[PDB]
Design a protein around this nucleic acid. Sequence first.
RNA 1: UAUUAUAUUUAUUCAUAUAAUUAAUAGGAUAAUAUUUGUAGUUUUUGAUACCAUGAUAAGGAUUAUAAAUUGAAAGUGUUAAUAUCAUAAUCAAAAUUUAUUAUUUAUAUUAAAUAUGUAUGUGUAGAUAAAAUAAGAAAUUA
Lengths: 142, 49, 338, 58, 54, 59, 49, 165, 57, 157
Amino acid sequence: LKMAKSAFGFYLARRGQRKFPFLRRPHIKNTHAMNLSAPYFWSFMTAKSQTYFLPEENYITGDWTGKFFVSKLQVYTLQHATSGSTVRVKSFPSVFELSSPSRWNIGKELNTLTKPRMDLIDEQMLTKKQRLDYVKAGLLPK
Amino acid sequence: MLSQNVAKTTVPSYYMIRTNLPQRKPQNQWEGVYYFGGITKRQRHLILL
Amino acid sequence: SVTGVFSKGRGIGHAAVTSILRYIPRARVPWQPSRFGRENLSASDLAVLWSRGRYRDGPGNYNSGYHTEKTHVLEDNTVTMIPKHELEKYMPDISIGPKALVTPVSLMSARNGHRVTHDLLHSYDPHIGRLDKPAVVDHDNITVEDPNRVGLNAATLDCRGRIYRWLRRGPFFQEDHYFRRSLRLNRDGTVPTAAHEAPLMRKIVRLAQRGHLKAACEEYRRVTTVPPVEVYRALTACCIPGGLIADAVAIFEDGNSKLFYVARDGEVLHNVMRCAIKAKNRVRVMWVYNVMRGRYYENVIVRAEIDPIWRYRIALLALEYFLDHNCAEEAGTVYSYL
Amino acid sequence: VRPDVPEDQYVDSWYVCTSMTHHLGDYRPWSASAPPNAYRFRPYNEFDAKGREYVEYM
Amino acid sequence: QADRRTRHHMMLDGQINPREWMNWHPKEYQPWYFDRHKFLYERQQYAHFHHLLC
Amino acid sequence: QSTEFEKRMYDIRHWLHRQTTCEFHTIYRKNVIHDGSVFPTEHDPATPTTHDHHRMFSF
Amino acid sequence: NNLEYKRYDWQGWYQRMVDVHNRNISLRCRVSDLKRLDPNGVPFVDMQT
Amino acid sequence: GVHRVGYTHPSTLPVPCAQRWDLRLARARIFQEYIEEKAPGAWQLEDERSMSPEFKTFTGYPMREMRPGYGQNLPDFIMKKRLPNNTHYELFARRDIPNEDNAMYGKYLYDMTVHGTSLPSTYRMHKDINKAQRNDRKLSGNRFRVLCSSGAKKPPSGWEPIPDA
Amino acid sequence: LVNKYRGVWIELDMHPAFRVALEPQLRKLPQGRTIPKTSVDEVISDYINTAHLIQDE
Amino acid sequence: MRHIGQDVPKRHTHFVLESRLMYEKSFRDSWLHSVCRAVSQIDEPLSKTISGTRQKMLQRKVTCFQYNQYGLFKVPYYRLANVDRYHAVQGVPGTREWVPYANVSYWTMNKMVRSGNLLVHRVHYTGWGTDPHLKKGGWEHRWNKVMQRNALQYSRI
RNA sequence: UAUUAUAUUUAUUCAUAUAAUUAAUAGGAUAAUAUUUGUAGUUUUUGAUACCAUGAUAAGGAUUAUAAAUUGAAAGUGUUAAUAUCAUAAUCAAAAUUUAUUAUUUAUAUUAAAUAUGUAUGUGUAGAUAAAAUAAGAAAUUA
């Protein structure tokens, strides 16, 4: 686009505020994940039928040497609190370790737990223009 | 050595990059597909023997 | 002076050959005569070129799982590889093993010709995954590391010509070339009868002899290698009482000319002739006498001829059918050959 | 802008915002697309496009 | 490393450079076979006499 | 049905015109035999095939 | 096909794709031509059948 | 009304007659029809836009299932689902490669058959002609990037390259 | 060729009296596309024992 | 690689082969994945032959197998890349920049119509078109008419 | 002057891109015989790249018109055909808003299928701004 956050900003145009077909997006920017939906907790941003098998960042399918980080698509379960191990999510910027485990997390994916869009923004990545802009929209004071 | 192996490509030029000419023969439509039905000299000698 | 990606390579032919070969030049590619392809890479450098070249299922990727490196710097942040032993405490390992990627041969057509399930497509012909030695698809050690470099890699050096060959692949490609790259007639002149098909062939012959036709046929549906001639003998024999000329003719044709003419044996022809009798088929009697007569191609090239005593027994059965069925012209024809 | 002649003689050109005739300019007038002396060049001088179909349905 | 026999050269020393692939008619690239063992008059240098050969 | 005419019809597949092809629809009368031993018109059985025998993957 | 997929590497698998797309086999039958007599002397299918 | 689906044998009635659920069973046997049993009776909806000719799009066949709880996730869906084997996805796959000649044959094979040599791309021969000429008028701008450097850093027993001027 | 015999075809040119009379012998010998695993001694021993009484060179 | 002897002008044009072999692997694992999903999800008893306890152990085994199916392609067909073969332009399916029948994008396909590379027929820009279906009921109507002919018309045996 | 009308209506809270190796041909049954069953000469070049690397198709109404007629144009808007010589950045799922060039659902009933947006009740409410004479229905101050 304008400021290439990725190497694909080098490659993809914006098309303004291009209106999109309902649920057809080349970039799945799950900007709604950490949405507390009180009576809809085991439903909102979760698997549909309660009696489903687990997703597949949940079983070592082969003879791995290991991995650097899990996805958010692997549910949080008893082994994610008691085992107290390292479970990492590729969130902005590099990775996010779930090292303060709790039991309420048990059952959902880690999407409802890894904040997609942070309330703290580092002006260390923003431009001399973006900072004034975030002041404009009310994010950083000035 | 052989005559009919004449140049069907031109001197590698810039008229390839600058012009729309076709770098390959347009496929014919009324041409069959080339199959093999044919007996060799030895093979015909065998049947005659 | 030079900035080069590959340091060193390897020769394809060895010095018991090259030291006599070099004395004639090779007429090389005009625009780039020296062609340092994939075959010439080292073992390690080509393990690199094979590890990478896939999206998340080439182990070249730090978080692909079969990756070798333990450290990866993410924009000046280091992440280190959580191994399987730390991981299994929350990602309980289910690893069936090397047999869990190789589907049965009875699911090839359902899986569109394939048997493997690898990221890397496994062509069964030689000329596609051929690295230096022709790529043999060994379905017993198909790893994710992929040592044999037989895979139809995605983004490797010299991958474009083979990806084009794969897309220009034939209609029946995996099945035909997988069949023929195995299961060939041995120089002893004999048909390929194997070890693991003998018990299944026993199942088939016993069931068909008992007369359980569809049962024997559902079992024949599992004939992967070739059956010995007696299996067709029984699978046609069962048809006699019910008069299943159609099922019988098809049982014949499946080995006749399709399986190295195993089915071209006098007693199988005798069974199918009996079915022609009990189905009352003047034209099928003559078709079976026709396969009996054979032609040069079978009778000489594939050498699937019939013993003259069996020729005679089948001819007497044909005459006994026909002159009992008043078919004077065709009976006289068979007696003309007599 | 093109002869008054049964439109099925023209073909809309490709790439050219025009319309050319499949037979290369050789024309047959409206009265070749009708019976002799056909009233309004009707297929049968009885009824129009919807009169024919419905006489037929009845 | 690189020389006037390696670097891509149209002209070399006042006339054309034969070494560079890109200074040649494609009719020279055609497949052809050696003649020197045949009869002298049957060779590629007596091309204009192939129609007259006995 | 005259297989010889059909032979004459099939090789229009080649002398057809430019950028024009042909799909042949053939609707030809046939004979399929119904038969006693193998496809029996017997009574219902004693044990009834309820809805359980036609569940998913029961096919 | 006889334009372009008649002849080269793609001829094979396009013939596959074509004939598989057309693999349907429609069977129409006349119930009045089921209204026949079984050689048992019984009408093969009566009004109740 | 909340009515119990009842079905009396052809034996209880004082006239036997083939009953319709038994006929349903015979048909789901003959044509291997899955009988979904959770099918509630209050949901016999038909797609009016498709079944009712008082809309512009009367189709006559229920062009879809009026059932909001739908998705490919369901096995009843997966049962009656046309698979992408031999579909346009395959045709596109096997004919839509960036260069079309590489779908009819191999470029080297075609070259060695019609010409002699195996020719480069038009783009490559562009680069090579520019090499031929921008190394004719001038030199000393190049670089030596190779696939394998062992033979350049290590020439053969002879081959002492020429120093230019 | 996929199906060629790949070996020299020793034509068995016996008469339809002896191809029946010598049956247990040749049943252990190589017939058409069939070579039993019998022992060369067994076959040679039978050939030395029986073949003398055979009145046909 | 490393930009030495590039034969094509778009280094990204390797992604089209990459995608077509993505499609191949999708066709290869498609049947297996669909039957795996069916059996792992089936709740009402499969049959009178497999039921209950055997059903739970079998379901879990085939789920273990669907998971062990390494190389499996379970990314939905609407989620794969969709790129023009010619100038390597990507097009988001469902929006004007994607010609469906030629598998090209607004850009390359616009180039190929304003030059003579495709044979199309220019029709009016504001109307509906020549097809009576596309005139009748919009776009879902032609969708319906297409599925009706490719699937719904066969009185399937 | 005549060959003839804009002062009306409906409008404004607007956002989405990612985890490097593009260099080649290789036919298998119903075909009168190739183990060519399993076709093995490494290492002399360099552009479309993270980088200069010409061209070529949009948006934009203000006076060629009334009858059998359309209220959308060439001045070119990212990907394209000759300038080389810093670096591999390219979707196979799950993704990080600063980007002018955007029509949001408004108080009887509110989460079931690849998951699908939890924020902003407030006198229809500053300033400047949007659209349209086309199956809808509009009427009077030409340069």
